[model samples]
Target chain A: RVSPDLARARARHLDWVHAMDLVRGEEARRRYEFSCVADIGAYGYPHATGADLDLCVDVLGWTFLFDDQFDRERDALAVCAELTDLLWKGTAATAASPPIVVAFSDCWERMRAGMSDAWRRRTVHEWVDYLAGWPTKLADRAHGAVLDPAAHLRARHRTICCRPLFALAERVGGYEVPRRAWHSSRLDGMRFTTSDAVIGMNELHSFEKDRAQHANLVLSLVHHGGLTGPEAVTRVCDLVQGSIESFLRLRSGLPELGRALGVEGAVLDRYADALSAFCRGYHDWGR
Target chain B: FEFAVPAPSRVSPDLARARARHLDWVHAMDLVRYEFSCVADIGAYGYPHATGADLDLCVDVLGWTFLFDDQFDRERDALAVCAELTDLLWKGTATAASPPIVVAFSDCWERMRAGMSDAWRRRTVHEWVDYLAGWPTKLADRAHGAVLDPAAHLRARHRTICCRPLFALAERVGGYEVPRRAWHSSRLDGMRFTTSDAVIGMNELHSFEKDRAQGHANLVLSLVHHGLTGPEAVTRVCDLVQGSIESFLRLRSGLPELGRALGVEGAVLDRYADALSAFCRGYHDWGRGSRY
Candidate 1:
């Protein structure tokens, strides 16, 4: 019922898990191990190369630590801001860093070294935005606040699941999307809808636990929209289905966005297939 | 990082009204005096800024939220209760609502609907319906033995736990009608997200013990299931909660940019967001101090 690429994903998952030796503390190492095992990124990628998959998955696993550790953030903004710059500064600056920081910078050093500067910076921009959402989230946590439904779904556009995966895939999927090619609302809309579907599915599956934590779209809809629990789930499914259908509509129409950016149709196809695979493959993996 | 509760709203004793309301709801008569004795000061403490008619309304919102919360999770006939409530909520009617909250809410709903524009009411009603519909979903889940991994848990909670109807009332207090265009736009989503989760997360954090006992899966418990020990789970939950405030600020700050884009009033949105922030501070501190 699963793609053959799933086997490749598992292989890369192991490689990344074994590389947990890069972090020193038993805790950091253990965290890396757990993140690798638990990550959904593998479930999303049907055909990322073994080497690319390891780099991508490890980047993802470590980012989870970055997000988790800073869940109680104070200097994290400063920390991530510094990380953003140093990843540009290359290896000398981070040799004696915190274990998670070391892991990311090392990954960044290697990952960015192979990529074009435009793509690397684009990747960095996402990293920065991802880091940026933390302060907002941490403060809400401390204040015992809930993420507003709209704001949560909005931040969610950048946080947690989809955009970041696309960004990471750019780093190792063997091509770069230029900033000039950025802001194409057409394909961009397609991507956004697909990701929305992905995120909503995540929200749906996490409903029970979210009800417990007092977070997620399910409860957000309920607590805010005056929706019944079952109704909210049904509505979210409708939303997910709507967005995914929108993505498919856009995908089935034509594939001209990459060609305009001087990207090969084949290169674009590889990347696009992985993303579509994510829609089907990730959902399949979860069930 | 600290909980900043404004000087509590001047609590006007409404025990007489509360007693009457309780009487209207409770039939046994024995639990009458005893009922709501634990939380009679709910609105007074929770919405210190709300006063007069508004204060009374806030108190009702608090009472309803607290009392009816049980029916949502542990009702003897959850599906029945949920089905009935969902039916009423979707239709914007209270014809068959059995819960006192539903009856009370429907009364309040009419006034709000009367006051707001057709567009705004349409949008707000949809939200109200979503909030009410969440219960039946939970009813089905329990009926089916649903399980959630941690990430999925947080995702679902984002929609349900924010207790947004209370904040819908906050919009009335804050004194602005965010146009449906502005409201539907994503800029407000951040502030909306901030207000709701900041409240819900705190509720869960403070009520973790009771919630834990109730079999509700909090971040702490979920993390434990994810492999952390008890203290470790608490630490992670705290970390996640703390992270929300920063996200809250970022969400607020982005509104100016959004305001510029949409040509909406930034200050109005700011006041709205701040109103939400005030509710967060006020409610959490009240719960911490009270029987909750």
Candidate 2:
């Protein structure tokens, strides 16, 4: 039995997860990757039975891959929607869910009625082709002998792909997202960055979580102000170089699972540089 | 005087006509004497002492005394005319020369008590006294002068006629009650038409002094909520009060002698004139209107 203080802490943790789930559920469809990672972590500690812990770790790893796939699909959808919405208002309804469908359909019908037949046909075809090809390519990339049969992996892939698609849809819709929603997103980003920072700071303090959560990316970039803008790219590069050097120092003693996760010396260095480039190119103040 | 001799055929008619004519002459003489006395008294006590001019006062005093004498009533109309002429000359002409003629005479006397050796002071007192003595003459002069401009004379006469009965009513009711009933009385309607002119007059005269003492004497503010600087505002309550009292008195009856005493002609005309004349007469006469 947990102590009362631990029990109270557990209750608070549950409450936090509950709130996150509520917000996530409010979205059109919950993507498997982000949800799985968030859920496993949310359910991990207090309910950490042997079976639960095994399933959570497996799901988390699978979800992380799908997260990358979803982000790519979302980017493609964003480009398609932007072009379509400019030409025909309702032509962007390819991504609409229950709440957005009615408005998007209305806009599409009006645009179709107002536009020439040729323009309407061309816009509709382009919207369809972009939506079909993009998600399919993302899925094809994720398919593999090892990952193909994994329902958890597939769910993670789908889930991760959803985020970028959602972003594209939002941009296409020309929806006026309220200030509160913008504030919420900013806060989420802050929390994510801060959590990584906490882990990094703890590492410097205790050198703990070395085998568990891996090296903290947040601390590497903290010297530059944490993935802020283009100016921080160099700082991140240096920090990643240092992290790679640190990982190399400990690579000889790496466990099999750590090695399998690509936590080894040169692999960590390559991943760090890829991540640094991604942050520089993709992280936008516009969000 | 030509005595009408009675012919044997028309003795009664001749005797009656002679007696009436004699009475008229006697009354005329009496009015002249009263007018003279009144003017003289004013001239003696009222004019500037430095000039040593006594004739103006002598004429005014004697004239008023005879005018007020009961014996003159046998020929009241003629006597009234003679007395009126005296007032026209002395009060209208002579009194007009004095600054603050109504109250200055007494004020000069008080100042003179300090010392007669001061030539300027003596001159001031003497001039003020002379001005006071000339009150009847000035009044008569104005009456005669007003006739030259028929429109102004008519306007003044009309105002006098309208205000006369109001003054009579005010006198009959006494000061306190008169102001109240004056509203209902047609003759005194103007008194209550806008407001009690007398009360407003009193407020105007004293409001300044009251304001100096930090008391609320703003009649316009209290009664009509008039802004402080408007015509109705009580900046100089004392002057307003004096004007109102003088108007009221000259319009009122019992003040007939007082008007004549001050060398003012008729009751209607004397209210403002008497107050003004008395003011010029002396500063000690300052609250003389308050007595009535």
Candidate 3:
């Protein structure tokens, strides 16, 4: 997964992330030392400005902290509903709102300030899917129930939270794929493949952590598909390699896909470049 | 007093031809009037240009689902029916022990899949699963006597309304496939959702009285549960239906531009919109003619 050719994004924006008060004492301290959330923003949005980087880091960190609470909270559904309203309905965050909701409102407002309505609409859809997916995801893992491969893969696409970040990739790059081009199956393939690759990479890195929770993809394959541990590891590795290969091959056709959609070659190239950066930067950051 | 749905109203010229075969199928299946009456002419109004076998299949789909839902009204055995039908759809086979509805679906689905591409087949299967999947949720809601809020009700309504699979079938009837890439686009998906909303409003508007007397979940009932009076609830849903139609038309207008960008033929998008418009108007027309 290492990518020596890709430079690590130098800015961490830790101070801003810490100042947001998203996580309390030990959680904040551990996250600061871990530095994983900042790596995602720095790597995912390498070209972002200092201010944009701060915003990205803040939101990513907020999301990580919130996700931690999602599985553990007693009133998770109620909280999910509140956050859904905040994101979907543009409900105002109150002084009495949950800490994460308040922080999320701030991130949302800042992000909304400079984006197009189309981009916002697309991103919000992803956010809703992300939230809605949690119940189903948790259900699949309920009491050690392992989902079949296709169902698990489908759930991963929504729960991985990469779709909205990809939308943010366009935002940080300051360009939107035309509605037609954005909706095209070719771009859709690229998005899913990119998501697949990220998911696999995350799985490989977080296997131990996820295994303890009894929900790792490798574990699911082993349990459900009857793969040996070695075979499961190899299978997951193949998936990651296959997805990266698929992404590379898919981007090769972006020019023709662009031309067909009447998208300018330059615009497609920048979007392709952003995706390439995302994959490489994420791989490099993880290593 | 009336829904001013802005969706275009058009019907297939094959109405007379298809109605003859639709009634034959209805009678052959031994369906009661309650199961078959409302949906008998749905395909004629909805498909607009579908002729011959396409129109026949279209009629069966609408009528068949109504029959299937009616079975659900009787109990949870509808789940076993969904499982059997879903199995037939995905696996391409039905056992001898399969029920009559499942056998009929096997025949109908075989025709729908005959010349369609694998991409179309895969997506259509997904759509069918979504449609079938919602039934169990509805059963549980009804069993528990759940009174959903408007948003929750709409979310569930859109799924069980059977718009997704029917839209996929529209491509089949129209003699075109929305390119896998184009179909995956957000705009197309959004339009489908809007169309479903409009249809749900129309359907519940018509079904309100029956559902109220039977104590079933309906949008009008949902609104009433949330404090609106019957008249207010009806008015609110009509406004929603009107807004959805307007939203759909706005979305439809962008299809040509979307088609151009995707390099899809303009004619394909034109037919696509026509099919969707027909569904919006066709359902309203069907409701007007429907007894319940």
**Local distance difference test, per candidate?**
0.58, 0.30, 0.71
For model 3, fnat equals: 0.00
Candidate 3: pairs in clash: A183-B185, A185-B181, A261-B261
- TM-score of chain A in every predicted structure: 0.80, 0.21, 0.90
Candidate 2: residue A218 Cα off by (Å)? 86
DockQ per model, Cα: 0.03, 0.00, 0.02
Q: How displaced is residue B256 in candidate 1, in Å?
A: 3.7
Model 2 misplacement above 4 A: A1-287, B1-40, B50-76, B79-292
| TM-score of each predicted structure versus truth | 0.49, 0.14, 0.53
> Which candidate model has the greater DockQ, 1 or 3?
1
Per-residue C-alpha lDDT of model 2 across residues A135-194, encoded as one tens digit per residue? 333433332111111121222222222222222222222232222221121211222232
> Which has the higher TM-score value, candidate number 1 or candidate number 2?
1
- Candidate ranking under lDDT, highest first, comes to 3, 1, 2
- Worst lDDT run of 10 residues, candidate 3 chain A, spans A1-10
Measured with C-alpha atoms, the lDDT of residue B31 in candidate 3 is: 59
- Which of the numbered candidates is closest to the native, going by highest TM-score? 3
Could you give candidate 3's per-residue lDDT for residues B1-292 as a string of tens digits? 3555554677788888787787778677655444336467888888877888988999888888887777776444676677666555544456677777776677678888889997578568657866875676566555435466575577667678899899999998878898654575545665777788888888888888898898777888888886688899899998988888787777677777677665677787777777777787788877777468
